[PDB]
Design a protein around this nucleic acid. Structure first.
Ligand code: MG
Ligand code: MG
Ligand code: MG
Ligand code: MG
Ligand code: MG
Ligand code: MG
Ligand code: MG
Ligand code: MG
Ligand code: MG
Ligand code: MG
Ligand code: MG
Ligand code: MG
Ligand code: MG
Ligand code: MG
Ligand code: MG
Ligand code: MG
Ligand code: MG
Ligand code: MG
Ligand code: MG
Ligand code: MG
Ligand code: MG
Ligand code: MG
Ligand code: MG
Ligand code: MG
Ligand code: MG
Ligand code: MG
Lengths: 182, 50, 49, 51, 159, 173
RNA sequence: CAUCGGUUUUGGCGGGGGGAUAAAGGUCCGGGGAACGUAGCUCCUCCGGGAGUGUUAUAGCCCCGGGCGUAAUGCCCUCGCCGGGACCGAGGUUCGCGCAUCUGCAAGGAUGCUGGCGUAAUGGUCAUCAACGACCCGUCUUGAAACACGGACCAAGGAGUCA
RNA sequence: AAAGCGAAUGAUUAGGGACCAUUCUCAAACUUUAAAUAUGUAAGAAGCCCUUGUUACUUAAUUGAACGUGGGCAUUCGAAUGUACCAACACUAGUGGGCCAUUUUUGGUAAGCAGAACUGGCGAUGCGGGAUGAACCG
RNA sequence: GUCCCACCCAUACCCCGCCCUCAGGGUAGAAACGAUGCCCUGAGGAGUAGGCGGCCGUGGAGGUCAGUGACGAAGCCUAGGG
């Protein structure tokens, strides 16, 4: 016998997507080969993000793409996720965006501005190593569920209440006039 | 060549300890053989009740 | 020495051939094995290696 | 290496790891004699070893 | 247990030594504390205002807030399975600077001096402290003192 | 076990207050040098306040009997801890070497007084130069005028694997 | 069976080093002692001894020093070689690390030769005897083989479902 | 823990000189002293030095405090060993009767009794030994 | 009571074979692969309450095997075999 504190501990990170998307399987095969046969650390990160689930790949808007693309113009924006359209952005400059998905409104506006709306397999063609790329991630903690995580006294989190009003959680433990405050 | 030096180095170190000890006996003084610097540990009592 | 010693995986010796003695878990001074057998560890190593 | 070979028992394996092993044996470095009349302890070293 | 208020069991901890009670030396009020200092809490029982709980007596912490006649101390309190940051407002009368930090501060200043001196001179020097090493070979002369032969003594005397 | 005799010289580690400390010599009967140094610090702790941590072993070498082939008489003074107190005793042995006498005592003192190595302190071992120095009856009877005795009974030596014998052995060997 | 490889067990051989460069020991040359007093001598018995003197004599012994002698042995530590036996042969074109020398090799895991049988001979199942071992399950419990409860046996049905 | 009472408090024996100088023995809720084991913190780059900048705080005061720009110190970046434990998050199960032993220890005459501290075990665990055994030894 | 040699054996230790788990590498101008594969390397393996993963089996539904079957389906018996 040997004095060990853990046995057969598994890696905590995902090693293959749970999706049955046949096209996504082809994409992972391409980036398994690229990440193995190149010294590009960009390829490894893109391969890892292809495995991630849907809550770990939040959508990004064109406005957030535009916000980060200065003065990083002449670079290809790479988003392993969905690029959405922003109404609050009245004009869209000429951009090169490679993403897993484009909403119909976002793809039309990017292309109308004269830019490129390409997929990640197209990106691997002219940029097999992310030579001039901007890898961008959407807002992870912007989800509604995260507002509830870690709820407790003096935590300023969102409670599980089925209605908004002067009732249902406003009396005791919410103001000093009724007992105490939190 | 490095093996040559080491074999010679081991050979000379041992004789100096012997020569120092013998010369101390002739003089009547005492030579401290210097404390050992390397030790080998072996665990021989299981993994239970510690 | 630190890097050379740490590079070596701990030696996985076998039980001594002939040893040890009647009472093993006592100090070497009082007829056991535990503790500091100063230069006698070489005889033990031959048995266990 | 499918089968570890002991250099202490396999001569060929010893030679890949220590080319000076052959020279050590022929030169008889393990059997070097010391010559000359030994210098014994004086009578003062004894009679002090015994009280 | 039955009684679990403050000052419980502090009969000896919060007392004062045998012949050094009464008036408090004024050097305590003249010490100056900055943010980031490392101080030792030692509750003085002669002043009952602004004490720290008996758990923090004898502990050490880092000053984080300085106010008129008291300072704030960040102390890590072990609570079962975790440590908790504890911010303690304790009067300057119950604390004193830790000499361990001062000994470190004289060493960091010294290390710069040797490194500066060595680089200018042109040889390398060792900055890390080294633990005690095994003794080297040495020769002992018996020209003055010769060994004394000692033997175990008989029981002889009953008392 | 089988004991050798070592001389062990110790000393307090020199300090600024005591640049040259005193040397302490002692003769120890021990199975090996590791025990001999252990016995030295045990005896020196009680005697001269010196501890192993604050001291160093100057030397530890074996003293060999000068004439291992001469039969001589030994007188040993010891102190031991019984189950109810501490007692001094004096014994006499007829051996070849001081070590041989000491091995005899440890077996003798274990056989008769049930004492153990951890309970016995060897105060002094001397060689009796003459026969009137002998003060014990079991030793005076071995140094008589012309010692000569037979060996009565004296069962023969037969191999323990020779289970059966054809004739009854005779005890006149 | 032969030649190898891995692991291991048990013997034997040669050569070094160390300690008081073992201590002893034998012979010789010196000095000093004594008795469990050798010869000689003086007393009683005198088959057989005892007593005294006597320090090597017509035995010897103990201590110190020195030559032969850098003697030997013994213990410990080492550098190598050679035998007896057992278990194992994983892998499956070359590549490698090495050694030798114009051959190759014991060097990234067994080959060669030989013999009997070619079938119930090896092998498997079952029954039985034999050696060693083996308390009755489920459950509650700190603790069940329990002198704690449920269980005579067999078949079918039988208990985390849906909004 | 030990130690102390010709030292405070409390208990306490005996003699002596005119209360004093001594004497014997003690304290979980006494003490001038005072260990062992355990215990807090530090051993630097989020660091150190020089010049200088900001403020509505502070100073008699461009004096300080806090945070910085620009320079200098380099991977010997300031003990050892290891890293066969990187950090965080979400959701949820079972559990909330415990028992035994070395050492310390409380009530009790004591208990295979009742109750605690550290640690290790059985529950949840077979194996070799203690003939036999939940806890012992390996 | 003490001291000394030799010997016996645990699922423990060492070496080797095999299973599985975990971890780390290689494999496409494909002569190329149930790539959810193959090849190489290393470590580890007890377990109630409990958690998770993969597989085996039963009654039905859609697709498919141009599937089996009165020259014998399903069932049942079988110290016969894999
Ligand atoms: Mg295992
Ligand atoms: Mg054996
Ligand atoms: Mg292998
Ligand atoms: Mg105090
Ligand atoms: Mg108040
Ligand atoms: Mg072989
Ligand atoms: Mg020798
Ligand atoms: Mg062999
Ligand atoms: Mg058969
Ligand atoms: Mg058969
Ligand atoms: Mg049977
Ligand atoms: Mg049985
Ligand atoms: Mg059931
Ligand atoms: Mg019960
Ligand atoms: Mg019963
Ligand atoms: Mg019931
Ligand atoms: Mg019933
Ligand atoms: Mg006490
Ligand atoms: Mg005291
Ligand atoms: Mg008193
Ligand atoms: Mg400390
Ligand atoms: Mg609960
Ligand atoms: Mg239970
Ligand atoms: Mg167990
Ligand atoms: Mg792998
Ligand atoms: Mg049919």
């Amino acid at each position: 016998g040997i004095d060990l504190r853990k046995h057969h501990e598994r890696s905590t990170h995902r090693k293959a997507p749970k999706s049955d998307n046949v096209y996504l399987k082809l994409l992972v095969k391409l980036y398994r080969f690229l990440a193995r046969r190149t010294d590009s650390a960009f390829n490894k990160v893109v391969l890892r993000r292809l495995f991630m689930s849907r809550i770990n790949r939040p959508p990004m808007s064109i406005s957030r793409i535009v916000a980060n693309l200065k003065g990083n113009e002449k670079k290809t924006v790479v988003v392993v996720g969905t690029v959405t359209d922003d109404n609050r952005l009245l004009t869209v400059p000429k951009v090169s965006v490679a993403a897993l998905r484009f909403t119909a409104t976002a793809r039309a506006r990017i292309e109308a501005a004269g830019g490129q709306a390409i997929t990640l397999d197209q990106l691997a063609l002219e940029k097999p190593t992310g030579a001039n790329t901007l890898l961008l991630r959407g807002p992870k903690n912007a989800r509604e569920a995260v507002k509830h995580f870690g709820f407790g006294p003096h935590k300023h989190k969102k409670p599980y209440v089925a209605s908004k009003g002067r009732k249902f959680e406003k009396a005791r433990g919410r103001r000093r006039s009724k007992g105490f405050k939190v | 060549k490095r093996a040559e030096t080491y074999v010679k180095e081991y050979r000379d170190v041992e004789r100096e300890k012997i020569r120092l000890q013998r010369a101390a006996k002739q003089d009547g003084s005492f030579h401290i053989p210097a404390e050992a610097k390397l030790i080998f540990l072996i665990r021989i009592k299981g993994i239970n009740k510690i | 020495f630190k890097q050379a010693s740490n590079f070596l995986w701990p030696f996985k010796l076998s039980n001594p051939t002939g040893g040890f003695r009647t009472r093993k878990f006592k100090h070497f001074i009082e007829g056991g094995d535990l503790g500091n057998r100063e230069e006698h560890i070489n005889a033990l190593i031959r048995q266990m290696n | 290496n499918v089968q570890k070979k002991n250099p202490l028992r396999n001569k060929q394996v010893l030679l890949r790891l220590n080319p000076y092993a052959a020279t050590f044996a022929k030169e008889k470095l393990g059997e070097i004699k010391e010559e000359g009349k030994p210098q014994r302890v004086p009578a003062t070293f004894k009679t002090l070893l015994q009280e | 247990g039955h009684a679990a208020g403050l000052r419980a069991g502090t009969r000896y901890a919060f007392s004062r030594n045998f012949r050094e009670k009464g008036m408090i030396r004024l050097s305590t009020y003249l010490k100056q504390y900055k943010v980031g200092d490392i101080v030792d809490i030692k509750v003085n029982g002669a002043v009952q205002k602004g004490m720290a709980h008996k758990v923090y007596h004898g502990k050490t912490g880092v000053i984080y807030n300085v106010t008129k006649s008291a300072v704030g101390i960040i102390i890590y309190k072990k609570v079962k399975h975790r440590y908790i940051e504890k911010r303690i407002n304790v009067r300057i009368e119950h604390i004193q600077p830790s000499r361990s930090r001062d000994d470190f501060l004289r060493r960091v200043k010294q290390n710069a001096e040797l490194k500066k001196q060595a680089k200018a001179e042109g040889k390398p020097v060792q900055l890390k402290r080294q633990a005690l090493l095994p003794r080297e070979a040495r020769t002992i002369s018996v020209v003055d003192n010769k060994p004394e032969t000692v033997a175990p003594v008989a029981y002889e005397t009953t008392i | 076990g089988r004991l050798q005799e070592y001389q062990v010289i110790g000393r307090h580690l020199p300090t600024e207050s005591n640049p040259t400390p005193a040397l302490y010599r002692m003769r120890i009967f021990a199975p090996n040098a590791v025990v001999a140094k252990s016995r030295f610090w045990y005896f020196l702790r009680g005697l001269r306040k010196v501890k192993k941590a604050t001291g160093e072993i100057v030397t530890c070498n074996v003293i060999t009997e000068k004439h291992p082939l001469k039969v001589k008489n030994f007188g040993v003074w010891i102190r031991y801890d019984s189950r109810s107190g501490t007692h001094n005793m004096y014994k006499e042995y007829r051996e070849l070497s001081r070590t041989a006498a000491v091995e005899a005592l440890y077996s003798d003192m274990a056989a008769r007084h049930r004492a153990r190595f951890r309970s016995i302190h060897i105060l002094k071992v001397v060689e009796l130069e003459k026969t009137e120095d002998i003060k014990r009856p079991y030793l005076k009877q071995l140094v008589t005028k012309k010692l000569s005795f037979p060996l009565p009974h004296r069962v023969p030596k037969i191999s323990n694997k020779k289970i059966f014998s054809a004739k009854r052995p005779a005890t006149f060997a």
